[PDB]
Amino acid sequence: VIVDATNQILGRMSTHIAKLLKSGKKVYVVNAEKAIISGPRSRVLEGYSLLFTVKTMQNPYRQGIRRPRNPINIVKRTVRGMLPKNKLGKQIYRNLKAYIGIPKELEGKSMIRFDDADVSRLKGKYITVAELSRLLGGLK
Amino acid sequence: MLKHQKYVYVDIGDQKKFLKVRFLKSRSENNNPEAYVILDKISIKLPRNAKVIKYEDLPAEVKDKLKLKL
Amino acid sequence: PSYVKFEVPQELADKVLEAVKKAKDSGKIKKGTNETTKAVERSQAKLVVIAEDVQPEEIVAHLPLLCEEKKIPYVYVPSKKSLGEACGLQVAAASVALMDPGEAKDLVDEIVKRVNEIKGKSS
Amino acid sequence: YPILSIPEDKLAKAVIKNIDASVRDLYNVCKAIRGMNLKEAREFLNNVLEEKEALPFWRYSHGTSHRSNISRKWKVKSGRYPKKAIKYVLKLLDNAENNANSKGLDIDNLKIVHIAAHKGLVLKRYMTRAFGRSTRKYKYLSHIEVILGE
Amino acid sequence: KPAKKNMKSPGKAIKFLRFDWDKYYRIGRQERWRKPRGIDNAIRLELKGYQPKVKIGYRTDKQIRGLHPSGLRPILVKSVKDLEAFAKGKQDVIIIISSTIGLRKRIELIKKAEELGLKIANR
RNA sequence: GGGUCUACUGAGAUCCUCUGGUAGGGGGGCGCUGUGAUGGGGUAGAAGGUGGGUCGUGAGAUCCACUGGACCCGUCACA
RNA sequence: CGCCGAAGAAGGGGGGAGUGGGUCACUCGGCGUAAGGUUGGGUGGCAAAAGGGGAACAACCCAGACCUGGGUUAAGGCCCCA
RNA sequence: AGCAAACUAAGUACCGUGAGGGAAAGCUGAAAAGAACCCCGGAAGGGGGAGUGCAAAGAGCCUGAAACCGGGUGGUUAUACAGGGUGUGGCUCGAAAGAAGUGAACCCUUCCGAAGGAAAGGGGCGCAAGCCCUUAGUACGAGGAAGGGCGAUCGGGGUCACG
C-alpha cells in the first residue's frame, strides 16, 4: 500500500493515513517533500521555529528524536502526534516508513491520492515541504 | 494420615495415575481376599509417605476386579 | 429387566468386558446412544453390549428389536458403570457397539456363537 | 531434600548444620556450580580460593565491584572472595562422596543435582551505640544441603 | 431443566472480595467480604469498575435458588437413621454422605442409598 | 411494602405498587464460646492447617486429596 | 380547578435521636473600588449524589444508579487521537 | 488469658544509694525403645547408612500459618507502567470434589418474536446538503422453541499479549 503526497496538504493528507494505520496494514509514502502547508513564509517558519533548542545534525535519519528537522522528520511527528497514545499507538507507528523521492523497488506499484488534500482546495500562499528543510536546517 | 499404613496404594503400569484401598495387616495370608476392600479413588501423584504395592503383587483372585479398572 | 429377554450368567457377561477392553485399545468403539444406535441403522455394527440396569429403560428398550431385525448379535451386561469405565470413561455408558475388534478377532467370534444357544433355547 | 526423580541408589545426600556463613553471600554458591561436575567445580573454588578469578554475585552486589576476572558466567561482573563461606562448602562436599564411596559409585561421573541454601539459626546479642542506647547485633547462621548423583 | 444453566453462565457471578484486598496481604488471606463504612472510600461512593459494592439485586432465581449444581435438592445426612425420612422419593434430591463419617460405617451406609435408588455424590 | 391458603407457630398462591445515599431510627439474618436439653449424632479414618470444588447477594456455609494422632457437630432455647 | 386520601388515614398521644462552624453557582441588596472578602433575600446543588460532557474537577449543564440484557434519546459533540 | 506467679527460684533475676518497680519462660511417645553398629570430620542428639517403634517433625522433640528466604514446577521479560475487574486470544493444570456418553462442546435447518427499526428500486419536491409516499412495521432484530449432523471435552485454576 503506497500513497503519494505530491501537491497534498500535510495536515489534510495526514488524516486518512491514520485510519489506514488503525486498520493494521503496512504503508509507505514517497516524494513526501512535495506536500505543502498553507500560509505565508514568515508564519509557517515562525510557527515551527519556536521549538528550536540547538542546531547541528550528525547521523543518518534513523533516530526520531525530540526535535525534527529533516524533510522526512517533519512528516513523522505530524503523523505520529496524530496517533493513539495507548500501547498499540506506538506499535502501529512501527509500520510506517518515510522517503524522499522514489525508492527504486517501489516504482512499479500503484499509488493513490487523497482528493481532500489537493492544493486546489486551498486558496493559496503555500510552501512545499522540501523548502522547509532549507530553512529548517536540512542540507537536503 | 498414610503413615499409619492403614491404607495401601496400587501401582498400575507405574503411569501417572494411582489407585488406593484399605489394607488389613491381619488375616495373616498373602492369598486372603477379604484383607483387601476395593474402592474407587484414582490419584494423580504418589503420596509422600505412601506405601507402594505392585499390581502383580496382588493375589491372583483379586486381579479380576482390578484389571478392568486398569 | 423389561427390555431384557434372556438371562446371561455372570461368568459369560463378564467375559465380554475384557474383549471390550481389548476393543478400545486397537479398534473403533462408539460411545453415545445417539451414536451407537446409528451404527445399527448404518449397519456398521458387529457386536452390541446392553446394560440391564438403566433408568428409565425406554431409551435403550427399543434397541433390542431394531438390532434384531438386521440380525446382529448382542448381549446384556450387568453395570453401565463397569461398562462406562470399560469405555475409558469416568462415567457410565449405556449403549456401546463394536465397530471392529481389531486384534480381538479370535475371542469376539465364539462369544457370538456361544450366546446363540441361550437365545436358541429362549426362542 | 527436594528432588526425588532419579533413582535414589544413584544419589548421594549430605547436609550441614548451623554454620557461620552469611547466607547473603551463600546465594552465589548454590548458583555457582549448580549442575556442574564436581571435579572442575572443586578446583574452580580453589582457583577462587587463591584469586585466580573472583566469584560472581548476582544481586547482593553492594560493596563488591567489578574485577577483571569474570567472564565464564556471562552477565556477571561482580566479584568477591567468600573464603570463610566457601571453605565450608568444600568442607561440606567432602562429606558427600563418603556416602557415594559407601554405596559403590563412580566419583568422577557425579552430578550436583541439588544444592540447598537456607536461613540458619538466630543468635541474640545487643550492640551498644552512643547516647545510652542499644541496637541489634545478631550473628546469622546457615544450613546448606547438597544432593550428588550419577 | 433446559433453563437451568441459561442464567448462571451469562450472569457471571463476582468473587466479592474485600475493598482493597489486592494491595495488602493482610486482607487477601482473609478472603471474604465486608461493607466499607468510610467516607473517602471508593466503592461506597460507587466509582466505576471497582468490583461494585454488593447489593441484593444480584440474586439467583428462586426456581433454582440454592439448588444442587446437578439440579436436585442438596440435603445432608449424618447417620443411618436420617435416610428413612427422605422426602417424597429419589426423584428430586441428592445426598452428601458426611464429610466425617467413618468408612466402617460408610460401607453399610452407602449400600442403603442405591438400594433405595438415591443419588450419592461423595461416593 | 401493601390486598388469599396450610402448619401444636412458620410455610404457599395471586394482585398492585415501590427501588441513590452519611448524622439518625427501625426490620430481619450468619459466626464465636459455654449451659440445658436434644428423632439426634459423629469419632483412632475427629480437630486444625494447605490447596482446590459446590452452595448461597452477601454475611458465610459446605465438600474432595493430603497432613495430622484423640476427641467433635446438627436443631431449639438460654447466657 | 387540580392532586392525595379509608390497601397505604385530617387530628391526638407516646419511644428514640443527630442536627446549632456550611460552602459555592445564579439572581436582587448592603459594606466596602476591590477580593475564591464579608455580611443579607430567593433558588439550586453539593455536602450525603454515582452516571455523560466541560482535559483532568465538591459544586456548570444533562440527569437521581434493585440487577442483567436489548433499544431509543438528553447536555455535548461529529478531520485523527476518539 | 487466667491473680505476677502452672516452669529447676518466683516477689526469684534484675533497675534503682532509696522508699520502690518489676519480669520471661508449659507438651518426646505408653513404655527412652534416646538410634547399637559401619563410613566423614576433631567435635558437636553433627553428616550418611542401618535399627527401635503406629508414627518419628528423635532433644530445637504434638499438631506446625504468615510475614521470609532458597531449590523446583507452569507460564513469562531488556521499547518500555502501577492491577483490578473486564473482552479477545496464546500457552499451560486439570485424580476426585462440578456438568457431562441417559450427549458436553461445536455446526447447521426450521419456528416464535418485545420495543425498536432498515435498504435497492419507483415518483415527486428542494441549488445543494436531504426529505416526502411506496416498497414495510417487511427483511431485520434482544430473547425463547423445535428438529437434525457431529462427536468428547467443557465449566473451572495460573500466567502472558493487546483493547
PDB file of all heavy atoms in Angstrom, chain H residues 151-161:
ATOM      1  P     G H 151     -19.023 -38.624  14.177  1.00  0.00           P
ATOM      2  OP1   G H 151     -18.116 -39.159  13.135  1.00  0.00           O
ATOM      3  OP2   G H 151     -20.453 -39.016  14.180  1.00  0.00           O
ATOM      4  O5'   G H 151     -18.387 -38.996  15.586  1.00  0.00           O
ATOM      5  C5'   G H 151     -17.074 -38.575  15.910  1.00  0.00           C
ATOM      6  C4'   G H 151     -17.086 -37.573  17.034  1.00  0.00           C
ATOM      7  O4'   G H 151     -18.158 -36.624  16.818  1.00  0.00           O
ATOM      8  C3'   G H 151     -17.350 -38.140  18.417  1.00  0.00           C
ATOM      9  O3'   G H 151     -16.155 -38.622  19.005  1.00  0.00           O
ATOM     10  C2'   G H 151     -17.960 -36.959  19.158  1.00  0.00           C
ATOM     11  O2'   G H 151     -16.938 -36.076  19.594  1.00  0.00           O
ATOM     12  C1'   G H 151     -18.747 -36.265  18.044  1.00  0.00           C
ATOM     13  N9    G H 151     -20.165 -36.667  17.994  1.00  0.00           N
ATOM     14  C8    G H 151     -20.685 -37.579  17.120  1.00  0.00           C
ATOM     15  N7    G H 151     -21.964 -37.755  17.251  1.00  0.00           N
ATOM     16  C5    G H 151     -22.319 -36.904  18.275  1.00  0.00           C
ATOM     17  C6    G H 151     -23.586 -36.680  18.850  1.00  0.00           C
ATOM     18  O6    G H 151     -24.664 -37.202  18.558  1.00  0.00           O
ATOM     19  N1    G H 151     -23.528 -35.743  19.861  1.00  0.00           N
ATOM     20  C2    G H 151     -22.389 -35.108  20.259  1.00  0.00           C
ATOM     21  N2    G H 151     -22.549 -34.239  21.260  1.00  0.00           N
ATOM     22  N3    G H 151     -21.193 -35.307  19.733  1.00  0.00           N
ATOM     23  C4    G H 151     -21.227 -36.216  18.745  1.00  0.00           C
ATOM     24  P     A H 152     -16.171 -39.392  20.411  1.00  0.00           P
ATOM     25  OP1   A H 152     -15.206 -40.516  20.328  1.00  0.00           O
ATOM     26  OP2   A H 152     -17.585 -39.660  20.765  1.00  0.00           O
ATOM     27  O5'   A H 152     -15.572 -38.328  21.435  1.00  0.00           O
ATOM     28  C5'   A H 152     -14.439 -37.543  21.081  1.00  0.00           C
ATOM     29  C4'   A H 152     -14.326 -36.299  21.927  1.00  0.00           C
ATOM     30  O4'   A H 152     -15.652 -35.752  22.167  1.00  0.00           O
ATOM     31  C3'   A H 152     -13.700 -36.496  23.304  1.00  0.00           C
ATOM     32  O3'   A H 152     -13.013 -35.307  23.661  1.00  0.00           O
ATOM     33  C2'   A H 152     -14.914 -36.634  24.204  1.00  0.00           C
ATOM     34  O2'   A H 152     -14.677 -36.312  25.557  1.00  0.00           O
ATOM     35  C1'   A H 152     -15.872 -35.645  23.560  1.00  0.00           C
ATOM     36  N9    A H 152     -17.275 -35.931  23.834  1.00  0.00           N
ATOM     37  C8    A H 152     -18.140 -36.671  23.083  1.00  0.00           C
ATOM     38  N7    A H 152     -19.333 -36.744  23.601  1.00  0.00           N
ATOM     39  C5    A H 152     -19.236 -35.998  24.754  1.00  0.00           C
ATOM     40  C6    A H 152     -20.165 -35.704  25.741  1.00  0.00           C
ATOM     41  N6    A H 152     -21.421 -36.142  25.683  1.00  0.00           N
ATOM     42  N1    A H 152     -19.769 -34.933  26.764  1.00  0.00           N
ATOM     43  C2    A H 152     -18.504 -34.515  26.783  1.00  0.00           C
ATOM     44  N3    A H 152     -17.533 -34.730  25.911  1.00  0.00           N
ATOM     45  C4    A H 152     -17.982 -35.481  24.906  1.00  0.00           C
ATOM     46  P     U H 153     -11.675 -35.390  24.532  1.00  0.00           P
ATOM     47  OP1   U H 153     -10.838 -36.480  23.975  1.00  0.00           O
ATOM     48  OP2   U H 153     -12.064 -35.432  25.961  1.00  0.00           O
ATOM     49  O5'   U H 153     -10.966 -33.997  24.240  1.00  0.00           O
ATOM     50  C5'   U H 153     -11.122 -32.901  25.123  1.00  0.00           C
ATOM     51  C4'   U H 153     -12.495 -32.284  25.032  1.00  0.00           C
ATOM     52  O4'   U H 153     -13.466 -33.140  25.689  1.00  0.00           O
ATOM     53  C3'   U H 153     -12.634 -30.945  25.735  1.00  0.00           C
ATOM     54  O3'   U H 153     -12.225 -29.870  24.916  1.00  0.00           O
ATOM     55  C2'   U H 153     -14.108 -30.891  26.100  1.00  0.00           C
ATOM     56  O2'   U H 153     -14.877 -30.466  24.988  1.00  0.00           O
ATOM     57  C1'   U H 153     -14.415 -32.360  26.381  1.00  0.00           C
ATOM     58  N1    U H 153     -14.313 -32.685  27.818  1.00  0.00           N
ATOM     59  C2    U H 153     -15.240 -32.176  28.704  1.00  0.00           C
ATOM     60  O2    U H 153     -16.155 -31.452  28.377  1.00  0.00           O
ATOM     61  N3    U H 153     -15.054 -32.538  30.010  1.00  0.00           N
ATOM     62  C4    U H 153     -14.052 -33.345  30.498  1.00  0.00           C
ATOM     63  O4    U H 153     -13.988 -33.599  31.695  1.00  0.00           O
ATOM     64  C5    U H 153     -13.141 -33.833  29.521  1.00  0.00           C
ATOM     65  C6    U H 153     -13.302 -33.498  28.246  1.00  0.00           C
ATOM     66  P     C H 154     -12.085 -28.403  25.541  1.00  0.00           P
ATOM     67  OP1   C H 154     -11.379 -27.541  24.563  1.00  0.00           O
ATOM     68  OP2   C H 154     -11.564 -28.541  26.919  1.00  0.00           O
ATOM     69  O5'   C H 154     -13.584 -27.893  25.678  1.00  0.00           O
ATOM     70  C5'   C H 154     -13.875 -26.759  26.472  1.00  0.00           C
ATOM     71  C4'   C H 154     -15.236 -26.845  27.108  1.00  0.00           C
ATOM     72  O4'   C H 154     -15.478 -28.180  27.612  1.00  0.00           O
ATOM     73  C3'   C H 154     -15.432 -25.946  28.312  1.00  0.00           C
ATOM     74  O3'   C H 154     -15.766 -24.628  27.929  1.00  0.00           O
ATOM     75  C2'   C H 154     -16.534 -26.642  29.090  1.00  0.00           C
ATOM     76  O2'   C H 154     -17.802 -26.301  28.561  1.00  0.00           O
ATOM     77  C1'   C H 154     -16.259 -28.117  28.785  1.00  0.00           C
ATOM     78  N1    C H 154     -15.514 -28.795  29.863  1.00  0.00           N
ATOM     79  C2    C H 154     -16.031 -28.929  31.158  1.00  0.00           C
ATOM     80  O2    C H 154     -17.140 -28.460  31.436  1.00  0.00           O
ATOM     81  N3    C H 154     -15.291 -29.569  32.088  1.00  0.00           N
ATOM     82  C4    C H 154     -14.100 -30.065  31.764  1.00  0.00           C
ATOM     83  N4    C H 154     -13.393 -30.692  32.703  1.00  0.00           N
ATOM     84  C5    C H 154     -13.561 -29.945  30.456  1.00  0.00           C
ATOM     85  C6    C H 154     -14.298 -29.310  29.545  1.00  0.00           C
ATOM     86  P     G H 155     -15.042 -23.385  28.628  1.00  0.00           P
ATOM     87  OP1   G H 155     -15.527 -22.142  27.987  1.00  0.00           O
ATOM     88  OP2   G H 155     -13.590 -23.669  28.695  1.00  0.00           O
ATOM     89  O5'   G H 155     -15.634 -23.421  30.098  1.00  0.00           O
ATOM     90  C5'   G H 155     -17.032 -23.322  30.281  1.00  0.00           C
ATOM     91  C4'   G H 155     -17.438 -23.650  31.689  1.00  0.00           C
ATOM     92  O4'   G H 155     -17.348 -25.076  31.920  1.00  0.00           O
ATOM     93  C3'   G H 155     -16.582 -23.067  32.792  1.00  0.00           C
ATOM     94  O3'   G H 155     -16.803 -21.692  33.018  1.00  0.00           O
ATOM     95  C2'   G H 155     -16.950 -23.952  33.965  1.00  0.00           C
ATOM     96  O2'   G H 155     -18.238 -23.622  34.456  1.00  0.00           O
ATOM     97  C1'   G H 155     -17.032 -25.309  33.275  1.00  0.00           C
ATOM     98  N9    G H 155     -15.732 -25.974  33.340  1.00  0.00           N
ATOM     99  C8    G H 155     -14.820 -26.175  32.344  1.00  0.00           C
ATOM    100  N7    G H 155     -13.751 -26.783  32.777  1.00  0.00           N
ATOM    101  C5    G H 155     -13.984 -26.969  34.128  1.00  0.00           C
ATOM    102  C6    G H 155     -13.188 -27.562  35.122  1.00  0.00           C
ATOM    103  O6    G H 155     -12.073 -28.067  35.000  1.00  0.00           O
ATOM    104  N1    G H 155     -13.812 -27.534  36.357  1.00  0.00           N
ATOM    105  C2    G H 155     -15.049 -27.004  36.601  1.00  0.00           C
ATOM    106  N2    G H 155     -15.493 -27.072  37.858  1.00  0.00           N
ATOM    107  N3    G H 155     -15.799 -26.440  35.688  1.00  0.00           N
ATOM    108  C4    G H 155     -15.199 -26.465  34.489  1.00  0.00           C
ATOM    109  P     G H 156     -15.540 -20.711  33.090  1.00  0.00           P
ATOM    110  OP1   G H 156     -16.013 -19.363  33.487  1.00  0.00           O
ATOM    111  OP2   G H 156     -14.782 -20.889  31.831  1.00  0.00           O
ATOM    112  O5'   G H 156     -14.655 -21.316  34.266  1.00  0.00           O
ATOM    113  C5'   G H 156     -15.170 -21.401  35.583  1.00  0.00           C
ATOM    114  C4'   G H 156     -14.385 -22.360  36.443  1.00  0.00           C
ATOM    115  O4'   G H 156     -14.310 -23.669  35.823  1.00  0.00           O
ATOM    116  C3'   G H 156     -12.936 -21.996  36.707  1.00  0.00           C
ATOM    117  O3'   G H 156     -12.797 -21.020  37.720  1.00  0.00           O
ATOM    118  C2'   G H 156     -12.326 -23.336  37.080  1.00  0.00           C
ATOM    119  O2'   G H 156     -12.640 -23.674  38.419  1.00  0.00           O
ATOM    120  C1'   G H 156     -13.081 -24.282  36.149  1.00  0.00           C
ATOM    121  N9    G H 156     -12.326 -24.481  34.910  1.00  0.00           N
ATOM    122  C8    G H 156     -12.696 -24.096  33.653  1.00  0.00           C
ATOM    123  N7    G H 156     -11.798 -24.388  32.755  1.00  0.00           N
ATOM    124  C5    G H 156     -10.774 -24.983  33.471  1.00  0.00           C
ATOM    125  C6    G H 156      -9.532 -25.503  33.033  1.00  0.00           C
ATOM    126  O6    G H 156      -9.073 -25.552  31.889  1.00  0.00           O
ATOM    127  N1    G H 156      -8.791 -26.019  34.088  1.00  0.00           N
ATOM    128  C2    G H 156      -9.195 -26.026  35.400  1.00  0.00           C
ATOM    129  N2    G H 156      -8.343 -26.564  36.284  1.00  0.00           N
ATOM    130  N3    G H 156     -10.352 -25.542  35.822  1.00  0.00           N
ATOM    131  C4    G H 156     -11.083 -25.041  34.809  1.00  0.00           C
ATOM    132  P     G H 157     -11.862 -19.741  37.480  1.00  0.00           P
ATOM    133  OP1   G H 157     -12.263 -18.697  38.451  1.00  0.00           O
ATOM    134  OP2   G H 157     -11.900 -19.428  36.031  1.00  0.00           O
ATOM    135  O5'   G H 157     -10.404 -20.253  37.871  1.00  0.00           O
ATOM    136  C5'   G H 157     -10.124 -20.691  39.192  1.00  0.00           C
ATOM    137  C4'   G H 157      -8.750 -21.304  39.317  1.00  0.00           C
ATOM    138  O4'   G H 157      -8.656 -22.505  38.515  1.00  0.00           O
ATOM    139  C3'   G H 157      -7.582 -20.452  38.854  1.00  0.00           C
ATOM    140  O3'   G H 157      -7.182 -19.524  39.843  1.00  0.00           O
ATOM    141  C2'   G H 157      -6.504 -21.485  38.551  1.00  0.00           C
ATOM    142  O2'   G H 157      -5.828 -21.843  39.744  1.00  0.00           O
ATOM    143  C1'   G H 157      -7.330 -22.688  38.078  1.00  0.00           C
ATOM    144  N9    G H 157      -7.332 -22.865  36.613  1.00  0.00           N
ATOM    145  C8    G H 157      -8.449 -22.949  35.823  1.00  0.00           C
ATOM    146  N7    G H 157      -8.177 -23.123  34.562  1.00  0.00           N
ATOM    147  C5    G H 157      -6.795 -23.168  34.514  1.00  0.00           C
ATOM    148  C6    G H 157      -5.927 -23.332  33.408  1.00  0.00           C
ATOM    149  O6    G H 157      -6.214 -23.479  32.220  1.00  0.00           O
ATOM    150  N1    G H 157      -4.596 -23.323  33.777  1.00  0.00           N
ATOM    151  C2    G H 157      -4.160 -23.171  35.060  1.00  0.00           C
ATOM    152  N2    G H 157      -2.831 -23.177  35.211  1.00  0.00           N
ATOM    153  N3    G H 157      -4.952 -23.012  36.110  1.00  0.00           N
ATOM    154  C4    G H 157      -6.255 -23.020  35.769  1.00  0.00           C
ATOM    155  P     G H 158      -6.581 -18.097  39.431  1.00  0.00           P
ATOM    156  OP1   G H 158      -6.258 -17.361  40.673  1.00  0.00           O
ATOM    157  OP2   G H 158      -7.500 -17.480  38.446  1.00  0.00           O
ATOM    158  O5'   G H 158      -5.196 -18.449  38.727  1.00  0.00           O
ATOM    159  C5'   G H 158      -4.118 -18.981  39.483  1.00  0.00           C
ATOM    160  C4'   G H 158      -2.843 -19.071  38.677  1.00  0.00           C
ATOM    161  O4'   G H 158      -2.871 -20.229  37.806  1.00  0.00           O
ATOM    162  C3'   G H 158      -2.556 -17.919  37.736  1.00  0.00           C
ATOM    163  O3'   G H 158      -2.030 -16.789  38.397  1.00  0.00           O
ATOM    164  C2'   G H 158      -1.586 -18.544  36.751  1.00  0.00           C
ATOM    165  O2'   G H 158      -0.302 -18.643  37.335  1.00  0.00           O
ATOM    166  C1'   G H 158      -2.160 -19.950  36.620  1.00  0.00           C
ATOM    167  N9    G H 158      -3.087 -20.076  35.483  1.00  0.00           N
ATOM    168  C8    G H 158      -4.454 -20.119  35.563  1.00  0.00           C
ATOM    169  N7    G H 158      -5.039 -20.254  34.408  1.00  0.00           N
ATOM    170  C5    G H 158      -3.993 -20.290  33.507  1.00  0.00           C
ATOM    171  C6    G H 158      -4.020 -20.420  32.105  1.00  0.00           C
ATOM    172  O6    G H 158      -4.995 -20.524  31.363  1.00  0.00           O
ATOM    173  N1    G H 158      -2.749 -20.420  31.566  1.00  0.00           N
ATOM    174  C2    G H 158      -1.600 -20.308  32.294  1.00  0.00           C
ATOM    175  N2    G H 158      -0.459 -20.321  31.597  1.00  0.00           N
ATOM    176  N3    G H 158      -1.559 -20.183  33.607  1.00  0.00           N
ATOM    177  C4    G H 158      -2.784 -20.188  34.149  1.00  0.00           C
ATOM    178  P     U H 159      -2.270 -15.327  37.788  1.00  0.00           P
ATOM    179  OP1   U H 159      -1.933 -14.325  38.824  1.00  0.00           O
ATOM    180  OP2   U H 159      -3.616 -15.315  37.176  1.00  0.00           O
ATOM    181  O5'   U H 159      -1.184 -15.219  36.632  1.00  0.00           O
ATOM    182  C5'   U H 159       0.187 -15.455  36.904  1.00  0.00           C
ATOM    183  C4'   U H 159       0.959 -15.668  35.632  1.00  0.00           C
ATOM    184  O4'   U H 159       0.475 -16.865  34.972  1.00  0.00           O
ATOM    185  C3'   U H 159       0.794 -14.575  34.593  1.00  0.00           C
ATOM    186  O3'   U H 159       1.659 -13.480  34.823  1.00  0.00           O
ATOM    187  C2'   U H 159       1.066 -15.306  33.290  1.00  0.00           C
ATOM    188  O2'   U H 159       2.463 -15.458  33.101  1.00  0.00           O
ATOM    189  C1'   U H 159       0.468 -16.681  33.577  1.00  0.00           C
ATOM    190  N1    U H 159      -0.933 -16.830  33.114  1.00  0.00           N
ATOM    191  C2    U H 159      -1.239 -17.038  31.785  1.00  0.00           C
ATOM    192  O2    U H 159      -0.403 -17.074  30.903  1.00  0.00           O
ATOM    193  N3    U H 159      -2.580 -17.182  31.517  1.00  0.00           N
ATOM    194  C4    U H 159      -3.623 -17.155  32.415  1.00  0.00           C
ATOM    195  O4    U H 159      -4.779 -17.300  32.031  1.00  0.00           O
ATOM    196  C5    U H 159      -3.224 -16.955  33.762  1.00  0.00           C
ATOM    197  C6    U H 159      -1.934 -16.806  34.043  1.00  0.00           C
ATOM    198  P     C H 160       1.174 -11.996  34.469  1.00  0.00           P
ATOM    199  OP1   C H 160       2.033 -11.012  35.165  1.00  0.00           O
ATOM    200  OP2   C H 160      -0.286 -11.967  34.693  1.00  0.00           O
ATOM    201  O5'   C H 160       1.451 -11.883  32.908  1.00  0.00           O
ATOM    202  C5'   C H 160       2.721 -12.213  32.381  1.00  0.00           C
ATOM    203  C4'   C H 160       2.652 -12.465  30.900  1.00  0.00           C
ATOM    204  O4'   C H 160       1.951 -13.703  30.641  1.00  0.00           O
ATOM    205  C3'   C H 160       1.893 -11.433  30.092  1.00  0.00           C
ATOM    206  O3'   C H 160       2.683 -10.295  29.808  1.00  0.00           O
ATOM    207  C2'   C H 160       1.485 -12.215  28.852  1.00  0.00           C
ATOM    208  O2'   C H 160       2.571 -12.301  27.949  1.00  0.00           O
ATOM    209  C1'   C H 160       1.238 -13.608  29.429  1.00  0.00           C
ATOM    210  N1    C H 160      -0.187 -13.883  29.709  1.00  0.00           N
ATOM    211  C2    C H 160      -1.018 -14.389  28.709  1.00  0.00           C
ATOM    212  O2    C H 160      -0.576 -14.579  27.572  1.00  0.00           O
ATOM    213  N3    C H 160      -2.312 -14.643  28.989  1.00  0.00           N
ATOM    214  C4    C H 160      -2.776 -14.427  30.218  1.00  0.00           C
ATOM    215  N4    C H 160      -4.054 -14.690  30.468  1.00  0.00           N
ATOM    216  C5    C H 160      -1.955 -13.926  31.261  1.00  0.00           C
ATOM    217  C6    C H 160      -0.681 -13.675  30.960  1.00  0.00           C
ATOM    218  P     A H 161       1.980  -8.901  29.453  1.00  0.00           P
ATOM    219  OP1   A H 161       2.995  -7.824  29.495  1.00  0.00           O
ATOM    220  OP2   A H 161       0.760  -8.795  30.279  1.00  0.00           O
ATOM    221  O5'   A H 161       1.541  -9.081  27.939  1.00  0.00           O
ATOM    222  C5'   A H 161       2.508  -9.281  26.925  1.00  0.00           C
ATOM    223  C4'   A H 161       1.852  -9.374  25.577  1.00  0.00           C
ATOM    224  O4'   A H 161       1.131 -10.624  25.475  1.00  0.00           O
ATOM    225  C3'   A H 161       0.808  -8.309  25.304  1.00  0.00           C
ATOM    226  O3'   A H 161       1.396  -7.131  24.804  1.00  0.00           O
ATOM    227  C2'   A H 161      -0.120  -8.980  24.305  1.00  0.00           C
ATOM    228  O2'   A H 161       0.421  -8.893  22.999  1.00  0.00           O
ATOM    229  C1'   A H 161      -0.067 -10.437  24.756  1.00  0.00           C
ATOM    230  N9    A H 161      -1.188 -10.831  25.631  1.00  0.00           N
ATOM    231  C8    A H 161      -1.043 -11.341  26.895  1.00  0.00           C
ATOM    232  N7    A H 161      -2.162 -11.655  27.486  1.00  0.00           N
ATOM    233  C5    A H 161      -3.111 -11.336  26.539  1.00  0.00           C
ATOM    234  C6    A H 161      -4.494 -11.450  26.574  1.00  0.00           C
ATOM    235  N6    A H 161      -5.140 -11.902  27.637  1.00  0.00           N
ATOM    236  N1    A H 161      -5.188 -11.058  25.502  1.00  0.00           N
ATOM    237  C2    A H 161      -4.510 -10.599  24.446  1.00  0.00           C
ATOM    238  N3    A H 161      -3.199 -10.439  24.289  1.00  0.00           N
ATOM    239  C4    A H 161      -2.541 -10.841  25.384  1.00  0.00           C
TER     240        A H 161
END
